[PDB]
Amino acid sequence: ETIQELILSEENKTNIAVLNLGTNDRRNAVLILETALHLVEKYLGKIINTSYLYETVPEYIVNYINELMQNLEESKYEENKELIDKCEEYETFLKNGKVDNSILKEVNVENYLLECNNIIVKNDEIMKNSYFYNLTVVVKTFVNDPLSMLVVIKYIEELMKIIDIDILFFNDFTIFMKNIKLEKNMIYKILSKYIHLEDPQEIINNMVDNIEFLSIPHVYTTHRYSILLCLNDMIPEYKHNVLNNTIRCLYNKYVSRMKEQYNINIKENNKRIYVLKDRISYLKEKTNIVGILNVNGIFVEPKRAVQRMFEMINEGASVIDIGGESSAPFVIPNPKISERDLVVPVLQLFQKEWNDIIVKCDAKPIISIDTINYNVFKECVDNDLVDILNDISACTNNPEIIKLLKKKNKFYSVVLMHKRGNPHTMDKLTNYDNLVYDIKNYLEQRLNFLVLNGIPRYRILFDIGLGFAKKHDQSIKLLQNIHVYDEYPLFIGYSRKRFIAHCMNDDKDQLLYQKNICGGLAIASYSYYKKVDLIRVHDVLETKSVLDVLTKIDQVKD
């Protein structure tokens, strides 16, 4: 073993890798980055963190996808979708603690900086001769070393044929290898260790020329805003030995320096993205209406419900939230009929009736299902009936449902809502030490749990659960302080809740029904100025009319 002593070593280890994923195809960004995300889970190890998606300014200065997915070679390492609460190796990575010794030879901090600076200054005047879509992931990887991992990454880039995947960190290592040449047989041997290889011929041809040197950290880690922007979401307290500071301090200095040194305000043109289904949404650029479809006095027939769905589409709802449970305080569900029996038939009919399309392939509303029950969501998702899980337990009731959010090539988005107890008990469970931050921190802990378990950060929506184990003054208090969610994708449901009525001064009890809907439009307005991303409403047309007037008043004509 001249080259293969330790590189091909049978002794299996667990490393932490931090990757950067980039594309400049805006229209296909989500499909390309998430196809890269699936090849990372498949070939490199386990995804235990992701940044938001960003639309980023170029910083040079400083459906064959669908075909491919049916024809992939099998990893020699097993998938494990089982939930985890902890990852020790990742704990160790973050404290810069004692991971295993590098099989690739390390440089010291001063040599690293010398060689890093040389690549950039040489890369600057080479460059002196569209938007980016960026994402970072932390991977718990079975790959033995960064060079091994770069070889597998370049294979992933080749399968995909558009995509840049870089290694930013690998363990606490500092590495600068200058004139790497791996023979084609050596590349095959490294791929074979991680993959059951079966047109992977000309691919090995390509890769020999392409792996020229190996920098860990990445040279541009510290020099691109787009990279620090992403790392700041995942690992802000991280300090590599080669960095003047923690990633958050590096991120903050960069933002500041652009203000004071150039008067730029760099956030304006590097935009945070959340994904509801398969398309980019710019965080805080739009208040989408989520139309409520309660399939539950009882016996809501599927035909009636589906025509309500079509009504709500025409009234301007961009999302439909269907549910067969009832969450009102002090009530129990319908006599016999099961949750699945209420929602699946409705959804199956809707899906058929929409398929009688004419030809608007992007006037289709996103479907959200309000369920905490695995069996219902499992059936909805297998039968392509829903896009979004609306879990009012924040996946707490049965965290197994988190496994259903990851299909082989698909990812589903999810709303995490705060409540305490159940409908009968929740009006009792009203004591908070720090209401606003208690609830915010709960949702942040839930998101960390999903993200640790491989759910993309940008597919996760926060919801404060207004009226769920909150007094009316507490529901109000969370709306007063909603700015607390300014960095995050936000979903709220005020519609027709008792607290609205508590705000009002003082036909037969239907005068209170009217003031309640009219009071909700006040909140729709408030939400609009607070740039709330989604509002769950019963009254789609009334809310739509309000958001259109407010939108028009904001648009300056020329």
Added chain:
Amino acid sequence: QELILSEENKTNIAVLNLGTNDRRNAVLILETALHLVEKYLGKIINTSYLYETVPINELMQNLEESKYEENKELIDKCEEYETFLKNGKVDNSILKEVNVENYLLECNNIIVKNDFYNLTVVVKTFVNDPLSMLVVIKYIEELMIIDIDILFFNDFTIFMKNIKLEKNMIYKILSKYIHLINNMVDNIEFLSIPHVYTTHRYSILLCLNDMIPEYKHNVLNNTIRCLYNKYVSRMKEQYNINIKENNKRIYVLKDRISYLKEKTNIVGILNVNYVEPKRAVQRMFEMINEGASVIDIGGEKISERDLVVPVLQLFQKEWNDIKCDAKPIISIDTINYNVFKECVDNDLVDILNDISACTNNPEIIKLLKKKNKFYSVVLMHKRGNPHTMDKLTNYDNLVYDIKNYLEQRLNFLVLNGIPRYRILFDIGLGFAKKHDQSIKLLQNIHVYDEYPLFIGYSRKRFIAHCMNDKDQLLYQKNICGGLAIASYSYYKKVDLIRVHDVLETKSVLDVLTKIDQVKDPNSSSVDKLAAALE
């Protein structure tokens, strides 16, 4: 003797300050004072806003009438006033007149020794000299609690250090201007013009900046505006305080204080064109119960007088079937002098809503003043009539043309002794405005931040322009889109909004008011720090 008694009746420009300490009756105390000024001194040709600052039913039928005669006729120019402002030649000072340093040294002598509801006025006065006026002013003070002071009198730099005037001399000045004294002697120690604290009390500079920003007395170092601006500059830099917070600008809809920009009042629309006056008066009570602060009645073959006076009279009677007083302010949507005169003589209305901005018949302004009473007015911008206005939409500068129009218009009413704090501005949405221009007026509503603003979007056609069986659908969207403008108006602090759908508007404003009522306005950063520390 002295020239003081000179029988001749030539005209001087006098700037007064008016103060009271009563909160509720401040209007009645200050407006009663404006009338007595008007009656015994000459003509009110300017007033400021009423400001709250951080430092009689019987009397009006038992009036000693004046030796002069009040000309109610409208004016558009005042030569004496225009000369006063440039400090041009005026009939020379009949009193002993000191110079700059002798005034400052003596001024300083009063400040260093003796170490709230404000309203300035300007008066074209027949009175010969400030001393004579201060006898009338003080005599007036004694009939009414109230401190009336002379800020200026022509360009005069008067200082008179000791003053004793025997009862016989006071009777002869009061008799000169009045068909008829104890304390004037005990109370009139000296005379300073300009008044000593002119350039010191913020409450005084604040009021003068409303009336005469570009006035420059040679005693003062700068124009009233630059002295005013520099002070606001100092209070922020040195003490790090916004002076506005506690010194609040006031407007008046009837007889009570309204803090400018602190509430969005609902004005409920009663169009008695769509009758049974019993139905319409039912609708007025309905609207009061749905939350209308104000009712705006209008009629426009049977006359508008026969459509609206019966209704207002039935109403005012049905309100007598109440044997406390959360009573609605009444607005009449008329440009007809005669219709407003009837209503005002029968005490059926508090406000003139004139959509011609008092341009159909400027004489209507004469009805906003009485012997004692004052009525407030809404001045709306439009062009043409309902048949022609949709084509009258070309403007040099849409936003500023309409502002300057309403500002020229307020200058006219104020020149004619209408109190500035009773004049509400309305941009007239949808009147000689394209839908995009109605929007642009709303987008630029901040341009009325200093002024009482009254707007009417309700059910207008531009709302529909904002939006993407079928007829009843457009009508519902129109009411719903209006609730967005109520929301916008609430956040832009629009003082009044004229709406058809009171209940819906009231629902919205209650919810928005609640979201804004923060128990502890430090809690957001406190609570955040707590969480960072836990």
